[PDB]
């Protein structure tokens, strides 16, 4: 019984994962079209940091303790260097290995056993499908929030409320010994990481039309 449940769940999860992966490959170009990254990438191959916010904050610490705030802002991950821009491949893809080891303890023998085996296979199919949907939803939420954090950082920096990253470069001429030579040494490093500022004076707002 429960063995049939488990094998049906396995088969359903694998099948649903395969179907969703193939449909995702079917709809490919618009995906990266939306989730471009190089455009957001800065001018020194620097991944901009991730910023999160919250509105109408309220914390009741305990009886006789209440604290409120208009909004709050937090930095998830500090910016860092990057060689190649990321992509949705490592965010939305789910694995798939076809299970091909059918072996169950209590093989159905009576008619009741056979029908309960069938219905358990069915419900396992359903459970696997919904669980796969849950996994997809979690992944898409994660990548969406990361993208939104990147966009938020860029536009807040445009709003001039955060420190832009500071990059230093140093140059050295030919380097090496009489057996090893480098033409032009060039050291690129980051000195001042982006961060928030609290001086209210430097706050410039915007007005649309």
């Amino acid at each position: 019984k429960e063995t049939a449940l488990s094998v049906g769940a396995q088969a359903g999860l694998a099948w649903r994962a395969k179907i969703i992966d193939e449909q995702l490959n079917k709809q490919a170009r618009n995906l990266d079209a939306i989730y471009d990254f190089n455009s957001l990438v800065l001018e020194h191959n620097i991944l901009p940091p991730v910023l999160l916010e919250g509105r109408n904050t309220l914390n009741l610490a305990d009886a006789q303790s209440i604290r409120i705030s208009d909004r709050t802002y937090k930095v998830a991950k500090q910016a860092h260097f990057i060689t190649t821009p990321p992509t949705w491949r490592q965010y939305l893809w789910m694995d798939y290995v076809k299970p091909e080891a059918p072996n169950v303890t209590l093989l159905p023998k009576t008619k009741a056993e056979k029908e309960i085996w069938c219905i358990y296979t069915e419900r396992g199919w359903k459970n696997g499908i919904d669980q796969a949907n849950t996994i997809l939803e979690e992944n898409i939420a994660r990548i969406k929030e990361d993208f939104g954090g990147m966009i938020l950082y860029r536009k807040l920096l445009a709003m001039n409320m955060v420190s832009p990253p500071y990059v230093s470069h140093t140059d050295l001429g030919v380097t090496g010994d009489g057996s090893e030579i480098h033409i032009d040494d060039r050291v690129l490093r980051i000195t001042a990481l982006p961060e928030l500022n609290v001086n209210s004076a430097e706050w410039r707002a915007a007005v649309a039309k």
Partner: protein, 165 residues
């Protein structure tokens, strides 16, 4: 960790008759432990109403380890302790041998006795004189039991007895 008194499954891939003890190997097919091997031995019961296997030397793959959990076997899809084999291996052979020896004795002696009230004498000769030695030899060798033989393509279920780590 194995709970005390649960059920695992393995496949027996080698066959042997219940005549001489030896090492017998099976392989756990699924579950937490995959591809584990298990060598052990059997026992010979008083009667051929069943046959069971003692499986103790179980080796798990992955690491250089060999635990010694001891457990027995149950009949797959029967939930019983019997063995699938034949049991009438040497019943009728010894039965007929003994009966024919006695019949020889009787034929010779009775057809010698009934003479008062040459080929017939020769038949009496052969039967009456060769019946007795065959009768005693058959009574000597009648005690050999019917053996059983496990199969090399039948799975089995194994219930645990103790825990491991």
């Amino acid at each position: 960790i194995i709970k005390t008194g649960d059920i695992m499954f393995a496949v027996l891939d080698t066959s042997v008759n219940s005549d001489e003890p030896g090492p017998i190997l099976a392989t756990i097919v699924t579950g937490k432990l995959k591809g584990s091997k298990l060598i052990g031995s059997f026992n010979l019961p008083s009667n051929a109403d069943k046959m069971v296997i003692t499986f103790n030397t179980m080796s798990i793959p992955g690491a250089e380890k060999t635990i010694s959990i001891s457990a027995y076997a149950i009949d797959p899809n029967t939930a019983r302790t019997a063995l699938a084999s034949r049991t009438n291996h040497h019943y009728l052979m010894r039965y007929g041998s003994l009966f024919a020896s006695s019949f020889l004795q009787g034929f010779g002696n009775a057809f010698q006795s009934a003479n008062t009230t040459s080929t017939l004498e020769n038949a009496v000769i052969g039967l009456a004189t060769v019946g007795k030695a065959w009768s005693q030899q058959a009574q000597q060798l009648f005690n050999t039991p019917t053996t059983v033989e496990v199969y090399s393509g039948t799975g089995l279920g194994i219930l645990f007895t103790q825990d491991v780590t």
